[PDB]
Design a binder for these strands. Sequence first.
RNA 1: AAAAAA
Lengths: 124, 124
Amino acid sequence: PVTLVNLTPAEVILHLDGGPLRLPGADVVPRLLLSEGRQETLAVYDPERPGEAAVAREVPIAVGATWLGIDPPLPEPRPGTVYVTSRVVAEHFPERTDLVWPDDLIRDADGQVVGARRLGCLPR
Amino acid sequence: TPVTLVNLTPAEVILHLDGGPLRLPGADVVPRLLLSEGRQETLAVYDPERPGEAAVAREVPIAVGATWLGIDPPLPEPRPGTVYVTSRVVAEHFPERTDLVWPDDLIRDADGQVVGARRLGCLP
RNA sequence: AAAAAA
Ligand SMILES: [Mg+2]
Ligand SMILES: [Mg+2]
């Protein structure tokens, strides 16, 4: 058996047949490193006032912000440890066979992710 | 000319802008990715409540290498003056579509849950 | 794996 270590900032709950398995969120919020891309503004109608250009909002948009890396970097592989991260992180480290993501997600009444029915990992 | 933002994601999207927030209601129906089954296995994991005790280890389903097949529902057809808010993972799978954006530069609460975004992102 | 670290 392996120890699961949650690198994601939210609590991860795996809904298993005998009851849930709960992994606490990481102590520090991790981040992706992205380029700025081309910084523009998108004029959007205020959903409160549809079709009224007079009271349209200016929304910042990053056009083509690109993956530069992650901060912090992945922890080194440790015997008997499997790291729970995001799929997007795992896909950027395909050599790592100790990375999984929560998968087959469960959402609440507000459409927010609250759990997962399984883990996923890259082809091996 | 301003555009109408349409939220295709199941959660409420809040863009935290300088003049006040812009709120987009969640989609009425929870959309899903279509994935292959991959190789279905089980991962023996220590119960975080009882670390290192193999006796009370849990069995976690894992899908190894489940692959993108498509989406259900499909994207709405392009409409003049409409921009669709979706996930980055969906947008990246439809690079020809220049009317897709995702929420970006995310804000997380004390429990590590996404509660807002400071900008939009789109492909180069 | 549908809110660039579920
Ligand atoms: Mg809803
Ligand atoms: Mg996501």
